[PDB]
Amino acid sequence: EAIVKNYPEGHKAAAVLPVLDLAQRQNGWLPISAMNKVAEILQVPPMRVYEVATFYTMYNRK
Amino acid sequence: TQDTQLIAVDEKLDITTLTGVPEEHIKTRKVRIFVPARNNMQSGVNNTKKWKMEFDTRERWENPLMGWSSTADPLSNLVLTFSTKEDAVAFAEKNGWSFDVEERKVPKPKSKSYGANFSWNKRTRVSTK
Amino acid sequence: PKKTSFGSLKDEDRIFTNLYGRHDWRLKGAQSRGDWYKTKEILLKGPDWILGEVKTSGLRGRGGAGFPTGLKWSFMNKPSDGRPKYLVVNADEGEPGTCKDREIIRHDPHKLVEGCLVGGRAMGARAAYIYIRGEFYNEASNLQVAIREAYEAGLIGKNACGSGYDFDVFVVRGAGAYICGEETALIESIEGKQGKPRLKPPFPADVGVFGCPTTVANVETVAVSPTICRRGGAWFASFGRERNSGTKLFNISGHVNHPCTVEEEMSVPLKELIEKHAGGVIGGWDNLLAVIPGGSSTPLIPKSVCETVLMDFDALVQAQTGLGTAAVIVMDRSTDIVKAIARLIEFYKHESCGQCTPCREGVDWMNKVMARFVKGDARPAEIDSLWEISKQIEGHTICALGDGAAWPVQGLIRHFRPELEERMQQFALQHQ
Numbered sequence: 157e158a159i160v161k162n163y164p165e166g167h168k169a170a171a172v173l174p175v176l177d178l179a180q181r182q183n184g185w186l187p188i189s190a191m192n193k194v195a196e197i198l199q200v201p202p203m204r205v206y207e208v209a210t211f212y213t214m215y216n217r218k
Numbered sequence: 219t220q221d222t223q224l225i226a227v228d229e230k231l232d233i234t235t236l237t238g239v240p241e242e243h244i245k246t247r248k249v250r251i252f253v254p255a256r257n258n259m260q261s262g263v264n265n266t267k268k269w270k271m272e273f274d275t276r277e278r279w280e281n282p283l284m285g286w287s288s289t290a291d292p293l294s295n296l297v298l299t300f301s302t303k304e305d306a307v308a309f310a311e312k313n314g315w316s317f318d319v320e321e322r323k324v325p326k327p328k329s330k331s332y333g334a335n336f337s338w339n340k341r342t343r344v345s346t347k
Numbered sequence: 348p349k350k351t352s353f354g355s356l357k358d359e360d361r362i363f364t365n366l367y368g369r370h371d372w373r374l375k376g377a378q379s380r381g382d383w384y385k386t387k388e389i390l391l392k393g394p395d396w397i398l399g400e401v402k403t404s405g406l407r408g409r410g411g412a413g414f415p416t417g418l419k420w421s422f423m424n425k426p427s428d429g430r431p432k433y434l435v436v437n438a439d440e441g442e443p444g445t446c447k448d449r450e451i452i453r454h455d456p457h458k459l460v461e462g463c464l465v466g467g468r469a470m471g472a473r474a475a476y477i478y479i480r481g482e483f484y485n486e487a488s489n490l491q492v493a494i495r496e497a498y499e500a501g502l503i504g505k506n507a508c509g510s511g512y513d514f515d516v517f518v519v520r521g522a523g524a525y526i527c528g529e530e531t532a533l534i535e536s537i538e539g540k541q542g543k544p545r546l547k548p549p550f551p552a553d554v555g556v557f558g559c560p561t562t563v564a565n566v567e568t569v570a571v572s573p574t575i576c577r578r579g580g581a582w583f584a585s586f587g588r589e590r591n592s593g594t595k596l597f598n599i600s601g602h603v604n605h606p607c608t609v610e611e612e613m614s615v616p617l618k619e620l621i622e623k624h625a626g627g628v629i630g631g632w633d634n635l636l637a638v639i640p641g642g643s644s645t646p647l648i649p650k651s652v653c654e655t656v657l658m659d660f661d662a663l664v665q666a667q668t669g670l671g672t673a674a675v676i677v678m679d680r681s682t683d684i685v686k687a688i689a690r691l692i693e694f695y696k697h698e699s700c701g702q703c704t705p706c707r708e709g710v711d712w713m714n715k716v717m718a719r720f721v722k723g724d725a726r727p728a729e730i731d732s733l734w735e736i737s738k739q740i741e742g743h744t745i746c747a748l749g750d751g752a753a754w755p756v757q758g759l760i761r762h763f764r765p766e767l768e769e770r771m772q773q774f775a776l777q778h779q
């Protein structure tokens with residue numbers, strides 16, 4: 157929630173990259189459930205969350 | 219501007235009696251004047267610039283042999299092209315054919331801006347690119 | 348009136364006095380070195396004076412563009428329009444051979460935040476989003492420590508530096524991409540979507556981050572901005588050739604005895620810089636084969652060009668290359684030039700975002716062709732084909748990555764075609 161509040165209200169989708177990174181830290185690797193759970197908290201459709209995970213290299217999908 | 223024994227020929231051109239068409243194919247046929255729409259699969263527009271003349275379809279059965287699509291209407295594949303509706307609609311009754319005309323559909327101009335893809339307020343901001 | 352023998356800068360005029368981390372990089376050391384001093388007066392002078400003194404400085408974009416930073420930053424002198432105004436500092440530093448941004452962040456971060464503060468005031472921005480790359484986690488944490496120190500000291504935040512201005516700095520981490528270094532792609536990645544760059548009929552000054560105005564500036568450019576305000580554009584304009592002022596950093600790497608970093612005055616002779624700061628090419632200067640002047644994007648030049656060339660924008664431009672990021676990579680006579688360039692194209696293929704067709708397909712195609720060139724399994728006609736392909740993607744891509752990948756191929760071809768010819772002949776008679 158501190159990450160989301162860094163961004164302007166109404167564009168909370170911008171927190172996708174840092175929040176998805178947070179799921180990586182407490183899980184090592186992010187499974188599809190982590191990518192779905194990021195979608196619910198950030199209200200972003202899961203497809204857009206899937207785009208970010210596959211595009212950037214650091215996110216360990218395996 | 220041509221003195222060639224000019225006489226008053228007001229009555230409409232009625233060449234139908236000369237084209238040799240049988241009586242059946244001259245009244246009971248309803249031709250259609252239309253600008254063909256673009257093939258929705260494609261995006262080009264070079265096929266929607268000339269008015270087309272076509273005859274209403276008729277029976278098309280199957281042969282007792284291997285079974286092609288037989289027909290008995292000679293005016294089935296006849297498609298004519300005209301550069302203007304007035305020329306097209308004039309060729310119909312001059313040849314004596316009942317017609318219906320559909321006006322050309324012009325794609326209305328739509329204002330498109332790339333900056334709208336990333337809008338501060340409006341819901342037109344996209345979620346992917 | 349003219350300092351023709353440009354170079355050999357002294358410690359007094361050096362900006363990043365704590366470059367090697369030999370002094371306290373916290374607020375106490377930074378203020379000791381001369382930071383956060385009369386900042387309020389800079390704030391109270393007015394944005395016009397800040398912009399005006401940047402033009403006098405003649406500062407050019409130290410990120411791979413070389414644009415007249417004063418002219419670029421002047422694009423938000425327009426009146427307010429309801430939308431918030433935002434500043435963005437580029438800190439990706441993804442270009443190979445570029446290490447300068449890493450050093451300033453983790454050794455003199457307080458200069459950077461002050462740079463955002465004075466920069467934001469000049470451009471009227473509300474906040475600065477420093478986009479540090481994901482790998483620099485320790486650097487980002489070091490950056491945030493300075494931010495917290497500045498916030499507690501009252502330098503930034505509500506009534507920044509006791510001047511009424513309210514400025515905030517959010518340091519946003521990356522998730523791993525070289526394309527995020529691109530300004531519009533960085534603006535995109537901040538917004539949370541895929542890091543593809545956006546086309547520009549519009550510009551960040553009008554439409555940008557969250558749709559609000561923005562301006563992506565390199566870490567070095569903003570970092571030196573406050574010191575320019577303190578010492579003046581006249582002091583900054585004194586150094587460097589005309590239109591080539593300032594003291595640009597230099598990242599020397601490759602086949603050198605002591606690869607390092609140094610803040611040398613611009614328009615410096617290339618031979619001189621390698622000799623003293625770096626230590627000279629391994630095996631002597633005569634062992635040099637080719638040099639990457641300013642990063643992978645900048646095309647290479649051979650030793651013949653390397654004999655006398657000033658390290659700046661214009662001098663390299665007439666030398667069939669560019670200053671770029673001043674990432675000097677030397678390659679000795681023991682270096683497989685074809686193999687090294689093929690690796691650069693391999694890096695570009697692994698970093699293209701795949702949005703536009705020329706960069707998505709052309710770079711991959713150039714990767715496969717150059718791979719055959721390294722082995723020699725090709726024909727002399729392929730060299731010309733590679734030249735035409737590189738031109739096809741040049742200037743036809745959304746962002747400058749396509750041009751950034753075509754230039755190394757063009758640089759290699761025009762300076763080492765006989766090497767390519769010899770390798771293919773070597774492959775030919777071996778496989779007879």
Ligand SMILES: Cc1cc2nc3c(=O)[nH]c(=O)nc-3n(C[C@H](O)[C@H](O)[C@H](O)COP(=O)(O)O)c2cc1C
Pocket residue numbers: 407408409410411412413414416437438439440441442525526527528529530531563564565566568746747748751
């Ligand atoms: C593929 C690519 C990568 C780039 N990477 C960086 C980078 O890491 N850092 C940077 O400051 N500019 C980078 N740039 C340049 C930016 O797009 C932009 O021109 C510049 O950051 C603007 O700030 P400046 O005027 O201070 O250089 C890159 C450009 C391209 C095309």
Ligand code: SF4
Pocket residue numbers: 526543544698699700701702703704705706707744745746747748749
């Ligand atoms: S040049 Fe490459 S990275 Fe840049 S927009 Fe096109 S595909 Fe994406």
